[PDB]
Amino acid sequence: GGGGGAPTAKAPSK
Amino acid sequence: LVIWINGDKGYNGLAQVGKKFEKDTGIKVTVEHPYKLEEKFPQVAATGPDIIFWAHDRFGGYACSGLLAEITPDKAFQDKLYPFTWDAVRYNGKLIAYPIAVEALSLIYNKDLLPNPPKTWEEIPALDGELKAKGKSALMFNLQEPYFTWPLIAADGGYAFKYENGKYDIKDVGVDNAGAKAGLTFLVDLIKNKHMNADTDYSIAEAAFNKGETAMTINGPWAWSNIDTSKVNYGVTVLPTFKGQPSKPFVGVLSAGINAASPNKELAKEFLENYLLTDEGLEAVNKDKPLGAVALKSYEEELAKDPRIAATMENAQKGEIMPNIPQMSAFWYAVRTAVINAASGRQTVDEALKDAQTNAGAIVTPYTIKGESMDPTLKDGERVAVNIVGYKTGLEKGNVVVFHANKNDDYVKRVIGVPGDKVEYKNDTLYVNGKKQDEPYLNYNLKHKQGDYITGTFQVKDLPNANPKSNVIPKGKYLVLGDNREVSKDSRAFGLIDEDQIVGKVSFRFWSHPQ
Ligand SMILES: OC[C@H]1O[C@H](O[C@H]2[C@H](O)[C@@H](O)[C@@H](O)O[C@@H]2CO)[C@H](O)[C@@H](O)[C@@H]1O
């Protein structure tokens, strides 16, 4: 494909 | 303007076009030819050249990464170039580069050593016997780049990605079919019988042919200049057949793309449309290193008179236009590895092409990590590569997975249990299928903890989406935990995740490897 920036993978905390 | 073009092309000629542009406009043009530029470009794209020259196959990947501006030629300009050349530089409906020239590999041969070039690959072993008897060899060409070995691999039926009904099917890879195996086996047999050496690279073969040491090489039109200088009496001819089938080179269209981050897109457009892609501009480059069959109709009408261009196009017609899709990069890398490992004996042909088959179709996509729950394994802000996992396909304990958590968010956690696995924690001790399993990736956090234990006692049966009667993880379900166990919000909080949430596995570089 789309030309967009890379997606985000969250590493979430409690 | 800064311009990047490969070191084997007519960069001095291109510089002369650059000088004419400067003389007319005052705007200075710098032509560079960096080592492995096709790989450097994506790093520096957002810093590098205003214009990048490469065969069209690399450009879909660049565009997919947002590294290229859409080019805007009007109808009048488009009509000056062969329609098929514009096809090569179209990605997702948009024109993403200017096509310059069609390149196909040919058989190049020394007429004084070999007045009649062989019709078939099969003849080469015997021919080499004769040439060795006078201290020569039959054939030397670049074994380090799959571009050069591809024509033989594809001869009897190998292919990259199947093109059907207007689309490439990247699930349909033809790297390990019978034809590919037969071609690569023949190549390895040549090496086993010392008719070629596994270490022969571009410069070794070029020097050998130009010094009259070998009767034949395989190369593109850009190579003819050096052969002219060497005074070898050469011919350019159709590649030999293999098992009766023509060799099938992958055909490249040398193309010029414009950096999306360039503040000189309008000047780039002027240079390419009005200086380079003219009879005069192409002649300057061609006279330095020949371009092949040029995309500009008016100039090709002259070049097509050359018997060597007729031979180039004849070989092209037996081969196929390279795909320009982003996956092309993975294909080349996979095939390069296969040929190197087969040729050196590290792997058998079957082993090599089996791996190449897997690797060529494996989709790899970038992600950026946000948050602390995987620290220190992955840090906040860290850029990673994610190997996309096919629908209902091989997730394993220890894989770090990206998955859709909800409509808005993807998460990253480690797979601690797969379907069928019985799992529980006793304090910080992991039990899988009745056996304690070491978790070395928790070592740092285990030794720098705030509390008594980082994970804590829990059983799968107590978690959401589990079978409340068993610690055996249900079908289609996964137990995932973050490496920063003391802070991580993971399966302990939200329960088991489903197979259909999973996007892919994070690839890791191991810090140690052999020398
Ligand atoms: O060997 C894999 C390599 O093949 C092609 O690169 C060619 C290029 O097209 C030619 O212009 C010439 O410079 O030789 C190169 C081979 O060394 C593909 O274009 C490239 O993407 C691929 O990595």
Numbering used by the authors:
A (entry chain D): 201 to 214
B (entry chain A): 13 to 59, 62 to 407, 409 to 530
Task: Give sentences copied directly from the paper behind this entry.
Bacterial type I signal peptidases (SPases) are membrane-anchored serine proteases that process the signal peptides of proteins exported via the Sec and Tat secretion systems. The type I signal peptidases (SPases) process the majority of proteins secreted by bacteria. They belong to a group of serine proteases that utilize a Ser–Lys catalytic dyad, which differs from the classical Ser–His–Asp triad found in most serine proteases and in the eukaryotic endoplasmic reticulum signal peptidase complex. The human pathogen Staphylococcus aureus has only one active type I signal peptidase, SpsB. Here, the crystal structure of SpsB, the type I signal peptidase from the Gram-positive pathogen Staphylococcus aureus, is reported, and a peptide-tethering strategy that exploits the use of carrier-driven crystallization is described.
The third peptide, Pep3, is similar to Pep2 but has proline at P1′, making it an inhibitor that remains uncleaved in the complex. In contrast, in the SpsB–inhibitor crystal structure the peptide remains intact, with no cleavage between P1 and P1′. The hydroxyl group of the nucleophilic Ser36 is directed towards the plane of the P1–P1′ scissile bond, 2.9 Å from the carbonyl C atom, but the rigid P1′ proline pyrrolidine ring prevents further approach. In the Pep3 structure, the P1 methyl group does not protrude as far into the S1 pocket, with an average distance of 4.1 Å between the P1 methyl group and the residues of the S1 pocket, compared with 3.8 Å for Pep1 and Pep2. This is likely to be because the rigid proline pyrrolidine ring at the P1′ position prevents the P1 residue from further approaching the enzyme. In Pep3, the proline at P1′ prevents cleavage, both for steric reasons and because proline, a secondary amine, cannot readily accept a proton in acid–base catalysis. The P1′ proline carbonyl O atom is hydrogen-bonded to the ∊-amino group of Lys77 and the main-chain NH of Lys153, and the P3′ main-chain NH hydrogen-bonds to the carbonyl O atom of Val151, with the P3′ side chain positioned across the upper catalytic domain surface. Conversely, the orientation of the P3′ side chain in the Pep3 structure suggests that no further residues in the mature portion of the pre-protein are likely to influence peptide binding; only the nine peptide residues between P6 and P3′ are in close proximity to the enzyme. In the Pep2 and Pep3 structures, the P5 proline directs the peptide chain away from the enzyme, with no residues prior to P5 making contact with the enzyme. In the present study, the SpsB–inhibitor peptide (Pep3) complex represents a model for the pre-protein–enzyme Michaelis complex, whereas the substrate peptides (Pep1 and Pep2) give a picture of the post-cleavage state.
